[PDB]
Amino acid sequence: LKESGPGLVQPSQSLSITCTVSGFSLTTYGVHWVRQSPGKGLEWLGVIWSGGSTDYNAAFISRLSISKDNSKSHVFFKMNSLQANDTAIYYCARMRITTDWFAYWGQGTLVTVSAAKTTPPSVYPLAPGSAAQTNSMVTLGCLVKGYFPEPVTVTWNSGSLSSGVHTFPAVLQSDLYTLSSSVTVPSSTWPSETVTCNVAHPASSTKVDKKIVPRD
Amino acid sequence: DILMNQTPLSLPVSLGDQASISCRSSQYIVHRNGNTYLEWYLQKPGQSPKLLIYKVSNRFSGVPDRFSGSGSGTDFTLKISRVEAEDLGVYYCFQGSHVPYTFGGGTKLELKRADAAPTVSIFPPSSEQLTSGGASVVCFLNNFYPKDINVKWKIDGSERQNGVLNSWTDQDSKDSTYSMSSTLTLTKDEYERHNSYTCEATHKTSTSPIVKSFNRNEC
Ligand SMILES: *[C@@H]1O[C@H](CO)[C@@H](O)[C@H](O)[C@H]1NC(C)=O
Ligand SMILES: [Ca+2]
Hints:
heterodimer; A: mainly beta; Immunoglobulin-like; 2 domains; six-stranded mixed beta sheet; 18 strands; B: mainly beta; 2 helices; 19 strands; elongated; binds 2-acetamido-2-deoxy-beta-D-glucopyranose; binds calcium ion; immune system; Beta-Sandwich
């Protein structure tokens, strides 16, 4: 099952995904649609049956249509009035299975709902507070805030500090992505030696380096 | 609308353990044309869900003997006789009996390990950020186990909820721990109306909460 659709739709607008089926006939089998929101479990949206009728999840029935073309083996997912919380991976699938052969899923189509223009991140270095205690290990941070779209690349001293890094999944709020990165190093290496956050954002072709300096 | 309740939510296991996941429906999962449509799906990170069991008890093609399914009516159970590392992921049941069809909430199968307290680090807003008219306070809670944890922000002795965004990693494939970042974002002006900022973490490893804080005064 091959899917095609837009990675990006704007809030009030519509979303169409195409699912091209092969190996079985749509005259024989239903095709279902499922999605997964970023923090969340799988959710069933609807089905188009072999006979051409449809059923839907009641939270979506008023703004969702599944349609098909039996001759070209296409199934279409059309949904209106998208909102930021419709950002998800959308799958087409065979389900309600009766036998092993023909139980395929699509790859999934990532759909992101946002009004924002391509926007580079504000990168902020995070040194510890002035009174924070020092042990063998000191933790520093990087805040990559207000960017669009995904992804960004966060390295520390150009990759050399890989071990000891945590980079956290970005979360989407008010049309923009924000993420966080922490690196943990021996107190004998900072602030004595320089530690730097390197942030790359391919979509805006920006590359930004940000030294972690103590607050004086 | 049929509610599917999976339990437990989280199942820690050591490799080689027997494991049982339970799925209870709010209505009888009745047959359709002689078929009882109860199915189990596994999702590993970065991948599509994949069918394991269909029609309640039938192993799908390419699915090992160690996986079995049983049950009827409103009680169903997936069993793994001896857990391998390839089985770690989230398991979802699905019912195809009653429209609209519904998944359970999922059960996360995870690797058991020795308890580990979070390393908590708190960070005042960057100066560079205050210049733009925003202020974000950031707390890291790194390398803890088990996954169960509560994070509470306190400003001047008051629990604060608005402006808080959380984000977590899945289980680390090196050390089997979890990490988390919590980020309280306010306007510059609201941030300046206060002094004591605190990130409080409740976790199994500590009888009383792990606390880190600063005074804006000092930075
Ligand atoms: C999603 O957000 C929209 C827009 O604010 C709102 O109408 C809707 O109730 C929300 N639904 C869910 C499930 O979060
Ligand atoms: Ca119907």
